[PDB]
Every structure is written in structure tokens, then in C-alpha cells.
Amino acid sequence: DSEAVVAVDAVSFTLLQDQLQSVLDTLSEREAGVVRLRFGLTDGQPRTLDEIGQVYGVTRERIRQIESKTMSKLRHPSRSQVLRDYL
Amino acid sequence: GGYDTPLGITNPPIDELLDRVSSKYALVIYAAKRARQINDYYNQLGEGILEYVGPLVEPGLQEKPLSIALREIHADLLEHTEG
Amino acid sequence: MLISQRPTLSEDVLTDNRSQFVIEPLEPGFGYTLGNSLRRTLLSSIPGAAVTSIRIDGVLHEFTTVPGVKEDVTEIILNLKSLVVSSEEDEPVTMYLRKQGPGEVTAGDIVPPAGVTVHNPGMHIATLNDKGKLEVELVVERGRGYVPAVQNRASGAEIGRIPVDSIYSPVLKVTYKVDATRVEQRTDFDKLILDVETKNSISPRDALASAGKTLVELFGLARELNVEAEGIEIGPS
């Protein structure tokens, strides 16, 4: 049954979620909120730049600046060695 | 009682274990519920302290919790009520 | 070459004199190479002294029982056979135990001459009854290993002298076994476990040291053919 639950990717995915929430908690709060809303990690609904700037009450260019700054922070390998093995 | 000393899976001797409880089925469930208590102690140690306590005898270097449980049974450190 | 792992030697002291040595680890299989050789060396290479023969008054051919005592002849003999005694004088020296009156003769009753000594004077040997006097002579020399009861090379040069066994060795019982420690990281090495039990003349540690000295001489005989031959060096300690 090649669509059955493989039972090792599931626990790898749960460990991915735990480690990913830890690494996203290593940042500040506006940053992690922007990342979680930009990639839908809180409900499965991917919020875009205008919704995020609306729910934070700023402009969308500020949201894109914060997005680029944090995604530059995450590509630093100190925030990345614990996630590199997850591909 | 002059038995040579056991080793491995058989320490403490089951014939000294059976004098504590009624039958061996009670010995099994008694040891297993104590081992799950010890496992919940090791899992719930990182957060705040709750009602679990143990291991009451000092464990080994790396020792399985069921062996800690059975050595606690042989040490006369617990009690139980049946159903 | 290299041994690639240095073996050790440690003991577990059980009684005062009964030990248990372990040696670990070796190359498979060196445990049987050296355990049996070590057993034969312990039993048959340590010098020591014992009783060779005795003679007794009142008994000429009634070898069943001695008059005046309780215990029969062979019980006296196999009490005297288990008698720890040290010596230095290589010739067969004689010792006398002799005691009148009823009571329990012990090992401290005997009066040793110069050099010989008894290592358990508080040992029961015999009982006397009703004003009896027991007077036995001992013939004590030293030697190696275990000898049988040596048949009397003379016929009747000493008509009372009857021979016994002589447990020369200070050790009594040695047994051994092997094991299979650390099969995976080390590719199934061995572990020699000894069980030596001596009498109270010497310690088992000194027994094993003296046996190691005799063995290292006995294999140094084979070493001294081509001294510059490459072997397996364990190295420093």
C-alpha cells in the first residue's frame, strides 16, 4: 500500500515541527508572527502581504522588509544547521 | 538458601519475588505499573513537579525502568491493593 | 607487532586463601593457550614440603588400629597427610610428636627441629584414652608437585616406616574457564578466569607470581635461540 502512512516520515515531520517552532522562537515576536502568517504555519491559510500589514497595522513594504530581513537571518547557518538535515 | 548469585535478566530471583505478592500475575502488573510510574517520572522531570515519585532505590548507570521496578519490589519499598 | 590491546590481571579475594584471577582481553584463542599451562605450572612447579613417611610404636603388622588410642591407623594417616609444613633443609629431616595421658593431640604437640615449621598448630589430629602414650615419628622433606605413595625402596631397613602420599604443592585446587567479552568492537576476544585455592603457607597472589616466574624462564629457554626474532610485543605497562 504505497499510500499508507510510512510511520517514520510522520515522526520525522513532528520532530520537524518541534524544531522549527524552536528556531522560529529564537527570533523576536513580530518577526516570527510575520513568518508564520506568510507561510501559513498557524492555520494552514497562507496570509499574504496586505493581510499581514493589515493585521499589524503597517504598510506592505514594511512587511516585505521584515520578511527579507528575517529570511536573511534564517539563511545564516547558526539558524540552519538544525534544519539542513530535514531535506 | 545457598544459591549462587544470579546475573542479567534473572536478578532478583523470582522465588524471592513471589513471597511478596499472591500470584505471579499480580507480580507482573505490580512491576509494570511501577515501571510506567518511573517512566512518567523521567518524562515529566523537565517541567514542574507533580505527584509521581521514584526511583526509590538508586539505579544503575543505564538501567531499564522495569528492572528498577522489580528491584524495588524485592527491596520491600512498595505496597499494593488488588481488585 | 602490537598486541593492539593490553591485557590486565586483577583478582577477587574470596577467603583468606582462595582467590579468583581474571585476565582480559586476549586474542582468540589465547585463553586456552595459557590457562592450561598456568594450571599445570601452579600444580606442579612450586616447591614445598610435606610428610614422606611415618613410623609408630605399638604397631608392627596390625595396620588396622593402634592400641591405646581411639582413632584407627588410616585416619591418623590421612590426618597427617593434610598437614602444612615448610622446610629449608633439603635432606629428609625427622620430627617427633609424642604425648602421654588421655586427651586430644593437636598439631602443636609436635616438636620441630631447626628450620621446619607448622602453619596450623591448632589442628586436630588424634584422641587418646586412659593413660595411653602415642609416639609417632615423621619424615618430612621438600619437593615439587604431587608424588604418589612411594613404594618402599628398601624392604625392611626401617620395619616400622610406612610410606604415605606427599602433597608438596602449596596450592590445592585450580580450575579455569574462558569467556567471549566484547564480540563486536573487538572481534570476539577472550577472558580467562582462574580459581586458585591454596593452603595457608603462601598467598595465591605470590603463588601465581612464582608460577609466572618459572614459566617465563621456561619459555625464555625457547626465546634464547634467535633473540632478534620479531614477535608480538605488548609493550609498556
Binding site: 500500500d1 499508507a4 502512512v5 510511520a7 517514520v8 510522520a10 515522526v11 515531520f13 513532528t14 520532530l15 520537524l16 515541527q17 522549527l20 513568518v35 507561510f39 501559513g40 504555519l41 494552514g44 497562507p46 529570511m71 534564517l74 539563511r75 540552519s80 534544519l83 539542513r84 530535514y86 531535506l87 | 500475575y25 509494570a32 510506567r36 517512566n39 512518567d40 523521567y42 518524562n43 | 582468540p28 584463542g29 586456552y32 592450561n36
Partner: protein, 690 residues
């Protein structure tokens, strides 16, 4: 597998329809079908094999040769009779005293009547006599020396296990044999035979060119390292040199299990029959380490792996190196266009054929999406199903056979490119592997000791295997003991010193048996072989090895020294040369393990068999056993959260990894399947709370 009689098939009886009376041996089988050889499973008597001399009547009956005898004069007119004329007439024995003229000697002669009866007819009514002994017996069974001493059960086991030996890399001929090693090898087909006589021109490891006496030449190509149908090697090396003259019908090149023409199913090993240290306990066998070092028992196995690059609905597959997420570390063995390079050694799980399929568009999980957002690696819409070498296998790669649509090869519909990769390894002999002699005395390998802790002779020669004693007297197979003593006699070589006439045992021996060389090959035919007085007579004078040393005395025993402790054994022990085989029940084909693997489709049990992972069937009788212990929790475990509790299995695995407790088990899945089947059969089934 040819010459096989099988009473089951279409138009024939099946095994559940099979009564017990068809499986017996009716007395018309003598000379028409072997009573010994039959598979010892649930097919005993339904599958047989033809006799040696048997021949098929044009109406599909089984004729049998007979020597007709007229008026007490044994003629040579050989007349084939089927089983009806076998009942009409009367049939004598071939081990009867023919007085060199066709005449019998004693009047009271053994004979067979119609209904299987055995009588003493006067020697005037005998009208047919058997053509030889060993007529009743099959091909494989007639290759067992001293067969007439063995019981029929163990002879049956020996005949069914002589067909299971594997071709070793060396294949040395047996010392003690029958006649049937040469004939049943050159008739087996797997030996290249010189078709017409002549001289050798050119040899190699690959071809032989013969020069016929009239002009023509012909190249006999070999078959080097071809895979058999059960994964074993099929090498053919030549045995002729460049100036030799051959005749027609001569062996020119040995096959897999052949040696200078004749069969070689194993090697000649020094055996001893003491029980040593409990390692040869209850049919277990120990070996020297010399067999592992000198490659005495070592078989080459060749395995065929196969993948096809087929079409699909989304597009087309492609054999290529652009695989997905895989370190350029494991892409070192692969060539520029997929498949690995010839000779690169592989291990379990390695990549053999880089082959990648399209997948389509599936929306990602958001965590995977942000990982692709951080690292910048793309979606990679193709999905990799490469040909991975399965678990627990390794070895070199001999040959890579590749097909293609572009070469216009015959491929089935919707297939673009086929490739087969032949992987081969060289298995040493190892503990657990199955060895047996020629007498049904099978047994696994208990322990391969070193060569020093093996009981060696007075000449410092260690024994090679050590069988057990307690399996000999209760299985009634002392053919192995007679083979052992005669094997030592043929190894050392004898010389009956016939100085003052011939000794009394050796009178009816043939000539050139009065003396023999070391390692000289001998042979006993099956029902006319070495007598026991002749074995004592040969074993009495068995000329010494290099010194003046008769190692094995007249009793057939020897003073072994213990290799381990060092003392001599207090009693002399039987030694000799016994011919043993390596069976095809190797450990590496049998060991298996599964933690979590593939799952079945309709029901959700783990799958089955070593081809997949699968688990072992914890069947009904084992459920009874664990009920009878009273182990209730382990039964709940083994029937819920190891097999069918579908949501429970992943919780168990997660809780093990996190180090928590195992959760409480739920309902199995096959019960729910049962529930919906019962609701499908219009049966209102419902679970009631209280």
C-alpha cells in the same frame, strides 16, 4: 528434474484427492521406478523418478531389460518386458552363481513370482534373469556408495539432498564412488564433449578450436560465469592442452560440478566421529577454519536485478543521473547515463539504476514550503524510483545487459528501455550453513573453530569436520562409517602383501587392487561393492605416510590429541575421509528482520515473505500458547498495535522515539473489515454500549 515421474497434474490426481494406497510401492515397481527417491514433503510417492535401465513402451508403459535364460543356460538375448510379462514369467537375481557358461550352480535359486512373492524355485524353471544389480534404483540414488547398508529413510534423504549441492569454485572429485559419476555427468549435458576426434589447435579460457582429421575446424565456445536458474555459477573451464589429441565422445571441458569428466558435488574432508564440547550436539557439525581459509567450501552466487523504463499517464520515465535529493557521494559509482560501472562493489541500499519518474503537482506542507524558501532548492517535480539493491545483499557487478527501444529490440507495449544488472558475491562457508554427506546425515554448521583447537592426529594434521556419534546408531545409516573407513584406505593407499599366496579375504578381489597409491580413486558399485571382510583386509595394511607411522590401526581408529587442552584423548577415535556437500540452504538466504515495512492493501496487516519485509505469522497455535501462559498484554500487543491498529502504530513509533510510554491499544482493523462484510451480507450487526 528430467526423468521424473509425477502422478499429479491435469488429468491426474491432486494431493487432497490422493489416497494412501497410491503412495505405496507395488511390487511391479522393481526395475521400472525407484522405490528410494521421492520428495520427503507432502509428495511422498506422488513424484518419483525412472529406473536406470528403464525404457518406455510405445503405448506409454515402462519396459525393462531382462536376460533370458533357456534350459538353465543364461543367454545374452536382452528382451524388454513390461509389467504384464513380468507377471507371466519368473525372474531370477543377478548376484547368482553363474558358472562362467550360462549355467547356474545351486538348484535352489531366489526368484520372484507374479504377486510379489519370493520363492526358491529349482533352477530349471527360471526363464529370465536381471540384467545387473542396482536395476531397481534411480540415477541419483545409484551414486550413493554403500547404499545397501543404509536404511531407506536416510537413503531417501540422501538422494533428495544430493540434488541440492551448489557448485564450488574448485570441485574436487570424490575418492570413494560408484560407477554413476562419469556416465551421469557426460550424459547430463553440462560438459562440453568432443564431437568428432582430432587434435587441439587453440585453447583459452573462452574457446577451444579442435582440428578434425579431415580439414575442418570447430570452435567450442565456453559458458563463463553464466547465471543458473537458482542463482548459482555455471563456469566451464577446459581440461585439454594445446597439443593433446582427443577422440569423439571424450570430455573436453569440465562443467560446474564436474572434475576430469565425472561428478564432484563436494570435497573430500578429514572427518572424526567424537562428540566434541557440545558444539556437535544433535546433528550439528563443526568445521576447521582451514575450510574458510583455503576456500574449500566456497560457492559463487550470481543475482539478476531488473528494471524497465516504461511509459505513464503523466509522461515518460527516464534512466538518468539527475536524480533528486541525493548527495553527489552515492552518484560516484553510476556512469554518465544511469547504470553503475562494471566492477564497482555495492552494499545493501545502494543505487544501481538512476531512474526518475514524473509526479505532477501536489501542494506542499507549509514547513516543507518554508524549507524550500530558506534553502532555495526548487520543487523538483520529478519523483525518484531508482533501482536500489535490496536489503542484506552485496558483491561485485559482473555484467550489465541493457536493451532499448532505440535499437528496435523486442519490448512489450509501453516500455521504453530495459536494463538488467548482474550482481555477484563469493560466499564463504559460515556457521548455520547446511552440510551433508551422501547418506542423509544432514546438519548445520555449529561452530567454525580455529585450526589449533581442533583434534589433530599424531602427525600434526588436524581433522576438518567432526560429526556426532549419537546420530549414527539410531538412524541406521552406517554407510557413512563404511565410507569413512574406505575413504581413509583410499587416501593412504594399501598394499596387500601377497607374498605367500593371496590372503583369505582378498581372494575374490579383482586384480590391481592388491596395492594402491595415495589419493587413488576407488569405486564401489551399489549392490555389489566392498564386503566387510574386504574392508578389514584393506584397513589392516594401509602403508605409512612419510615416516614409519601407521596412524590408523586395524580397528579403524586413531589416537587424537586435544588441540585445546593438550592431553591425548583416553580412547581411540574413528577418523577418515568422508565426501560431504554444501547444500543450498545458506543462512544469508534465510535471515530476515522487520521493524516497520510495507503493508497489505485491503486489510492492513504487514506483508509477507523475504521478498518484501513482512513479519512472521503469529498464527492461531501461538495465540493458544500465549493464552495458556496467561500473557494477556502481549497478546493484545501482537494483535493490535503491531499488526492492525492503524492509527496506533504511528503513535507507538512516535512514543518509542520520544521515550514516552506506549499508548493504550485500540480496535484492530480486520475486525472493522469483518463488520462491514457482515453488514454487506444483510445482517444487522451493532455494538451495544450497555
Amino acid at each position: 528434474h528430467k526423468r521424473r515421474l509425477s502422478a499429479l497434474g491435469p488429468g491426474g490426481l491432486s494431493r487432497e484427492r490422493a489416497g494412501l494406497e497410491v503412495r505405496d510401492v507395488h511390487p511391479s515397481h522393481y526395475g521400472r521406478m525407484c522405490p528410494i527417491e521421492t520428495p520427503e514433503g507432502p509428495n511422498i510417492g506422488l513424484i518419483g523418478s525412472l529406473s536406470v535401465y528403464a525404457r518406455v513402451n510405445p503405448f506409454g508403459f515402462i519396459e525393462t531389460p531382462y536376460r533370458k535364460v533357456v534350459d538353465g543356460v543364461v543367454s545374452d538375448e536382452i528382451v524388454y518386458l513390461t509389467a504384464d510379462e513380468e507377471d507371466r514369467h519368473v525372474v531370477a537375481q543377478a548376484n547368482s552363481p553363474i558358472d562362467a557358461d550360462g549355467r547356474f550352480v545351486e538348484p535352489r535359486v531366489l526368484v520372484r513370482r507374479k504377486a510379489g512373492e519370493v520363492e526358491y524355485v529349482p533352477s530349471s524353471e527360471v526363464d529370465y534373469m536381471d540384467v545387473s544389480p542396482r536395476q531397481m534404483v534411480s540415477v541419483a540414488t545409484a551414486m550413493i556408495p554403500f547404499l545397501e547398508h543404509d536404511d531407506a529413510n536416510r537413503a531417501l534423504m540422501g538422494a533428495n539432498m544430493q540434488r541440492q549441492a551448489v557448485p564450488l569454485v574448485r570441485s574436487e572429485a570424490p575418492l570413494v564412488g560408484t560407477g554413476m559419476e562419469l556416465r551421469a555427468a557426460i550424459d547430463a549435458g553440462d560438459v562440453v564433449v568432443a564431437e568428432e576426434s582430432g587434435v587441439i589447435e587453440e585453447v583459452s579460457a573462452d574457446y577451444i578450436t579442435v582440428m578434425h582429421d579431415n580439414g575442418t575446424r570447430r570452435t567450442y565456445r565456453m559458458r563463463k560465469f553464466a547465471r543458473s536458474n537458482h542463482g548459482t555459477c555455471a563456469n566451464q573451464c577446459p581440461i585439454v592442452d594445446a597439443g593433446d589429441r582427443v577422440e569423439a565422445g571424450q570430455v573436453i571441458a569440465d562443467g560446474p560440478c564436474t572434475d576430469d569428466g565425472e561428478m564432484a558435488l563436494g570435497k573430500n574432508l578429514l572427518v572424526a566421529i567424537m562428540p566434541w564440547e557440545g558444539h556437535n550436539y544433535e546433528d550439528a557439525i563443526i568445521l576447521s577454519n582451514r575450510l574458510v581459509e583455503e576456500d574449500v567450501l566456497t560457492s559463487i552466487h550470481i543475482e539478476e536485478h531488473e528494471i524497465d523504463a516504461r511509459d505513464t499517464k503523466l509522461g515518460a520515465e527516464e534512466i538518468t543521473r539527475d536524480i533528486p535529493n541525493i548527495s553527489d557521494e552515492v552518484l560516484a559509482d553510476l556512469d554518465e547515463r544511469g547504470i553503475v560501472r562494471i566492477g564497482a562493489e555495492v552494499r545493501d541500499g545502494d543505487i544501481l539504476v538512476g531512474k526518475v519518474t514524473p509526479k505532477g503537482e501536489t501542494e506542499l506542507t507549509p514547513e516543507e514550503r518554508l524549507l524550500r524558501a530558506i534553502f532555495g532548492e526548487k520543487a523538483r517535480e520529478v519523483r525518484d524510483t531508482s533501482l536500489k539493491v535490496p536489503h542484506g545483499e552485496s558483491g561485485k557487478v559482473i555484467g550489465i545487459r541493457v536493451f532499448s527501444r532505440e535499437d528496435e529490440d523486442e519490448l512489450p507495449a509501453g516500455v521504453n528501455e530495459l536494463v538488467r544488472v548482474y550482481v555477484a558475491q563469493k560466499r564463504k562457508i559460515s556457521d548455520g550453513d547446511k552440510l551433508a554427506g551422501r547418506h542423509g546425515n544432514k546438519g548445520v554448521i555449529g561452530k567454525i573453530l580455529p585450526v589449533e583447537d581442533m583434534p589433530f592426529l599424531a602427525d600434526g594434521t588436524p581433522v576438518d569436520i567432526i560429526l556426532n556419534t549419537h546420530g549414527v546408531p539410531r538412524r541406521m545409516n552406517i554407510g557413512q562409517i563404511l565410507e569413512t573407513h574406505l575413504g581413509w584406505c583410499a587416501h593412504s593407499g594399501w598394499k596387500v602383501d601377497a607374498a605367500k599366496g593371496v590372503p583369505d579375504w582378498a581372494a575374490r578381489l579383482p586384480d590391481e587392487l592388491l596395492e594402491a597409491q595415495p589419493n587413488a580413486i576407488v569405486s564401489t558399485p551399489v549392490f555389489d561393492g566392498a564386503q566387510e571382510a574386504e574392508l578389514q583386509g584393506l584397513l589392516s595394511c594401509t602403508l605409512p605416510n612419510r615416516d614409519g607411522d601407521v596412524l590408523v590401526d586395524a580397528d579403524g581408529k586413531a589416537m587424537l590429541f586435544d588441540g585445546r587442552s593438550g592431553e591425548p584423548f583416553p580412547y581411540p577415535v574413528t577418523v577418515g575421509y568422508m565426501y560431504i556437500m554444501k547444500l543450498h540452504h545458506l543462512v544469508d538466504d534465510k535471515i530476515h528482520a522487520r521493524s516497520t515495512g510495507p503493508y497489505s492493501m485491503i486489510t492492513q496487516q504487514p506483508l509477507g515473505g523475504k521478498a518484501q519485509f513482512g513479519g512472521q505469522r503469529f498464527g492461531e497455535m501461538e495465540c493458544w500458547a500465549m493464552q495458556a501462559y496467561g500473557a494477556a498484554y502481549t497478546l493484545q500487543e501482537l494483535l493490535t498495535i503491531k499488526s492492525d491498529d492503524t492509527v496506533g502504530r504511528v503513535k507507538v513509533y512516535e512514543a518509542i522515539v520520544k521515550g514516552e510510554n506506549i499508548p493504550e491499544p485500540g480496535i484492530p482493523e480486520s475486525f472493522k473489515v469483518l463488520l462491514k462484510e457482515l453488514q454487506s451480507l444483510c445482517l444487522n450487526v451493532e455494538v451495544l454500549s450497555s
